[PDB]
């Protein structure tokens, strides 16, 4: 943990690599929802490549 003096009381700062790992099925669902990926494996590959 480090300090963020600019934050508001309801906010925290999260690294985006941790967030990418933690929110993965949500990302799969959103990728399939908007037509970017037609199957689960396509979304898996897209997340692996970090496009």
């Amino acid at each position: 943990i480090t300090v963020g003096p600019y934050l508001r009381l309801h906010q925290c700062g999260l690294p985006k690599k941790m967030a990418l790992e933690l929110f993965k099925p949500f990302i799969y669902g959103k990728l399939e929802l908007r037509g970017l990926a037609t199957t689960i494996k396509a979304a898996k590959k897209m997340v692996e490549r970090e496009e």
Binding site: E32, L33, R34, G35, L36, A37, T38, T39
Partner: protein
């Protein structure tokens, strides 16, 4: 005047040394000395252009974690020394220099092969030492122009043996400014701004001042005019691309289904309850869809995309 300011001018430029200079701006109204000085200091320390070494290739070395016989320094120390080389390029944004030396003694910046457009501002800068009479060194150095600080890790494939160097492009080492009282005969409240500038010797003080002022004036012109200022390709293919039978194709034509994207969203129960579509036709539709890795019952958002 009351509503008209006096405009400053460049009065004096004093060259204390090759890399140390003083610049004087005069006259200044009350309070404008600091207002101009701090902005100029920030811009001069932030955004000046310059040239730096970015790549090196030595004759027989493969990586930077090695040594060369007859040279007292490691490859990492040689890259460290090259990072501090001050070079002025006059016609291009990218040049390649060559160094070839032999015999016992210091290898300095005076041994770099001559070029018309490239000026070395400090030929006494030391690059390495040769401690063996039969030892010789030959290297190719790459120089290009930029601004800021671009580490090597941020920036089709590098051949084995090419060594990268972090690039510090700015020529300005430090800036100081001092506000004093002027000596205009008429009035008494006029000031004077003096800027001490220390660089590496590859930039002229006057052009640095003018470039900083130009950047500030260009940034300020957004206030003088202050005003209020996808889908995957397979989904777009028509259903005719499918090799459907006459019965199934006619049923789809009846149901106002034209593209694969429209068909894919239909579920099995809806296409079972529809007239003229039996089990065989539905199975054949699912079969031709499965041939391409697609399935009924998918969901899409913001479809159609303006067909």
């Amino acid at each position: 005047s009351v509503t008209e300011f006096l405009k400053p001018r460049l009065v004096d430029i004093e060259q204390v040394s090759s890399t140390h200079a003083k610049v004087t701006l005069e006259p200044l109204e009350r309070g404008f000395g600091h207002t101009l000085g701090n902005a100029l200091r920030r811009i001069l320390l932030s955004s000046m252009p310059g040239c730096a070494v970015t790549e090196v290739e030595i004759d027989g070395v493969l990586h930077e974690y090695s040594t060369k016989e007859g040279v007292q320094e490691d490859i990492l120390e040689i890259l460290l020394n090259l990072k501090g080389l001050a070079v002025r390029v006059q016609g291009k944004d990218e040049v390649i220099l060559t160094l070839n030396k032999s015999g016992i003694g210091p290898v300095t910046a005076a041994d770099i092969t001559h070029d018309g457009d490239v000026e070395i501002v400090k030929p006494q800068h030391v690059i390495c030492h040769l401690t063996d009479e039969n030892a010789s060194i030959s290297m190719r150095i790459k120089v290009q122009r930029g601004r800021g600080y671009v580490p090597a890790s941020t920036r089709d494939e590098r051949p084995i043996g090419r060594l990268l160097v972090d690039a510090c492009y700015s020529p300005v080492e430090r800036i100081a400014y001092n506000v004093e009282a002027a000596r205009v005969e008429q009035r008494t409240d006029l000031d004077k701004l003096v800027i001490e500038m220390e660089t590496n010797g590859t930039i002229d003080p006057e052009e640095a001042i003018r470039r900083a002022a130009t950047i500030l004036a260009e940034q300020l012109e957004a206030f003088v005019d202050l005003r209020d200022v996808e889908f995957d390709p397979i989904l777009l293919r028509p259903v005719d691309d499918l090799e459907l039978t006459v019965r199934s194709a006619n049923c789809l034509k009846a149901e106002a289904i034209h593209y694969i994207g429209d068909l894919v969203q239909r579920t099995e129960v809806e296409l079972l309850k529809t007239p003229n579509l039996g089990k065989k036709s539905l199975t054949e539709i699912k079969d031709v869809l499965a041939s391409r890795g697609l399935s009924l019952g998918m969901r899409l958002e913001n479809w159609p995309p303006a067909s």
